[PDB]
Design a protein around this ligand. Structure first.
Ligand SMILES: OC[C@H]1O[C@@](CO)(O[C@H]2O[C@H](CO)[C@@H](O)[C@H](O)[C@H]2O)[C@@H](O)[C@@H]1O
Ligand SMILES: OC[C@H]1O[C@@](CO)(O[C@H]2O[C@H](CO)[C@@H](O)[C@H](O)[C@H]2O)[C@@H](O)[C@@H]1O
Ligand SMILES: [Zn+2]
Lengths: 320, 57
């Protein structure tokens, strides 16, 4: 005939909205069991559930945000961001400013703020001393350093004065705010919070093969962006799998608004076997947690996010 | 029965519905100018058709 489609388009957007809202409504107890099941059935799942219970919220704590906002040199930070903005003439009146911010936090943290700690420096000896350090292995925390979030201390013997120096591994980001050094663990922990203190939309992304980083939502790029603070890197997810040529299995991200499997973003070769969990389960698992997580939000927040969700899904599977 | 949509369409379909609703008609258009069997369900009832669509998501 001559169908004409907006008449029909519009009808769709409308029935789609309701569809979506129904999904993110009722916590139907058919799932409550299937879920509950899986968290005992498979321990990998249990793993991530536990990770969500920590990561998905710890960082949304406004005391911390202000401690960090005190502690960083907000002057120097913005000063630079404004310099590097003035240089740009990208898109007319656009959110690109917050990208610069990230990039600058990225350099600030790495160049000025925080230190990488391979083996610690010998506190008795000078400052730049760390090979006349030989590892004696690990031990439980001295009780004093259990005040913070430390479950293990790597310990070192100095070969030049023969004194023990300790390197405790803390999860309290504020503590890190004082020690000012660590490995990717600490690096990512604190930098995630630094980012959240600007109320950027951030995720903490866990790679099963002992590496972690974060994701930030650039509004100007309209999608999640890969930020690693260690490598001082903005938007280059390939770094790990191609440049480092690292074998990877699962990559999953946790954020206050959801837990999503972000593997296909990162694991673009050197793909290990997935098999700690059945695929359909892992999907469900997230969706379920994400739901539980989004449980108390108005109807149009819910939709708006579930869209940004499907945006990502399409970016992941179509893997542009 | 079931839709019968190309993996690429069904994808971009759910892309634009969620990301660019403005263009969803011209997509809906061309998609029909291409699947004879579907164009039918459209002609003889948009309703059935759209319900079918929501099955894919
Ligand atoms: O290599 C994996 C592991 O090593 C770390 C720290 O030892 O990063 C190192 O490896 C990269 C290349 O393989 C280098 O680019 C990086 O500078 C170097 O420190 C961790 O980042 C990672 O977990
Ligand atoms: O110190 C790493 C830091 O430098 C950057 C700057 O753009 O570039 C690096 O990227 C790759 C691995 O990190 C290397 O192969 C390359 O040689 C190095 O310059 C950032 O990507 C990174 O954060
Ligand atoms: Zn010494």
């Amino acid at each position: 005939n001559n169908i004409d489609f907006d008449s029909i388009a519009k009808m769709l957007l409308i029935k789609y909205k309701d569809f979506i809202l129904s999904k993110f409504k009722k916590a139907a107890p058919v799932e409550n069991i299937r879920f509950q099941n899986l968290v005992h059935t498979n321990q990998f799942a249990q793993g991530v559930l536990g990770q969500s219970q920590h990561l998905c919220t710890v960082y949304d704590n406004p005391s911390w945000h202000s401690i960090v906002l005190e502690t960083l040199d907000l002057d120097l930070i913005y000063k630079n961001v404004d310099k590097e903005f003035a240089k740009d003439g990208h898109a007319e009146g656009e959110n690109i400013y917050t990208d610069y911010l990230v990039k600058e936090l990225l350099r600030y943290f790495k160049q000025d703020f925080f230190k990488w700690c391979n083996k610690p420096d010998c506190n008795h000896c000078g400052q730049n001393t760390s090979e006349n350090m030989t590892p004696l292995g690990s031990q439980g925390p001295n009780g004093e350093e259990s005040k913070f979030n430390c479950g293990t201390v790597e310990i070192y013997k100095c070969n030049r004065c023969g004194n023990i120096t300790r390197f405790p591994r803390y999860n309290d980001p504020i503590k890190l705010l004082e020690t000012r050094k660590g490995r990717c663990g600490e690096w990512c922990n604190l930098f995630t919070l630094i980012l959240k203190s600007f109320g950027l939309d951030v995720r903490y992304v866990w790679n099963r093969e002992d590496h972690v980083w974060c994701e930030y939502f650039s509004n100007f790029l309209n999608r999640w962006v890969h930020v690693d603070s260690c490598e001082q890197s903005f938007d280059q997810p390939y770094i790990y799998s191609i440049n480092w040529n690292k074998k990877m299995s699962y990559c999953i991200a946790f954020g206050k608004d959801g837990v999503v499997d972000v593997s296909k973003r990162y694991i673009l070769q050197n793909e290990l076997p997935r098999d700690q969990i059945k695929e359909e389960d892992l999907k469900f698992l997230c969706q379920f947690i994400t739901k539980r997580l989004r449980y108390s939000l108005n109807d149009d927040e819910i939709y708006q996010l579930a869209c940004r969700d499907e945006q990502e899904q399409i970016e992941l599977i179509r893997g542009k | 029965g079931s839709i019968g949509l190309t993996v690429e369409d069904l994808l971009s379909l759910r892309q634009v519905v969620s990301g660019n609703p403005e263009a969803l008609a011209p997509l809906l258009e061309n998609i029909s100018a291409r699947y004879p069997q579907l164009r039918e369900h459209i002609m003889a009832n948009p309703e059935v058709f759209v319900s079918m669509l929501l099955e894919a998501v």
